[PDB]
Design a protein around this ligand. Sequence first.
Ligand SMILES: CC(C)(COP(=O)(O)OP(=O)(O)OC[C@H]1O[C@@H](n2cnc3c(N)ncnc32)[C@H](O)[C@@H]1OP(=O)(O)O)[C@@H](O)C(=O)NCCC(=O)NCCSCCCC[C@H](NC(=O)CNC(=O)Cc1ccccc1)C(=O)O
Length: 160
Amino acid sequence: MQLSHRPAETGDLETVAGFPQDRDELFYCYPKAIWPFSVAQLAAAIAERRGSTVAVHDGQVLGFANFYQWQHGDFCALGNMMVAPAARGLGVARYLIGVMENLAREQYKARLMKISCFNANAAGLLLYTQLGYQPRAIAERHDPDGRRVALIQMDKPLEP
Ligand SMILES: CC(C)(COP(=O)(O)OP(=O)(O)OC[C@H]1O[C@@H](n2cnc3c(N)ncnc32)[C@H](O)[C@@H]1OP(=O)(O)O)[C@@H](O)C(=O)NCCC(=O)NCCSCCCC[C@H](NC(=O)CNC(=O)Cc1ccccc1)C(=O)O
């Protein structure tokens, strides 16, 4: 469907902060955040990151992403990837990741995009696989209940 993108704005914060539907979803897209998510937590992430971007369809903000890490000439890492629940499965994240890949290439001369995905997040793992990301390593992490989870580190070459 028809999608556009632009930098995130203050008026987008309340909608975007509403995207994660439970503690698990919040952990998957922003593991340092604390449930419940809030506009203050989102604004703080935006201020300390780069490239915060929204995807819009039919006047609705449906998706958000930024760079978790950025290293000129080297790589960027995708951060805070989240989509409105009613709009999932429709290509919003696919679209926005394409946008972020282009931004990494153009703004950071990145050769590689990194994406890390928690093991329980099948939807994420499958999407990133469809976009050409390959798994490289697995790291142990802990969820908010102190349970041990596996963070799967994936990457993809970008090219000029
Ligand atoms: C986005 C979403 C997954 C997808 O958005 P879509 O808009 O919905 O995606 P389409 O573009 O439509 O494409 C979807 C594709 O997948 C196929 N599909 C399969 N199953 C499906 C299903 N059930 N449903 C739908 N689709 C399913 C489907 O067929 C299609 O493939 P084809 O049909 O096209 O082939 C959507 O469902 C979402 O928002 N989920 C909730 C949030 C979320 O999980 N976000 C991803 C985060 S991974 C990124 C995490 C970045 C994390 C980062 N930190 C790090 O990296 C590392 N720091 C740390 O660890 C620090 C730390 C601190 C404390 C303690 C431990 C550690 C950061 O802090 O920011």
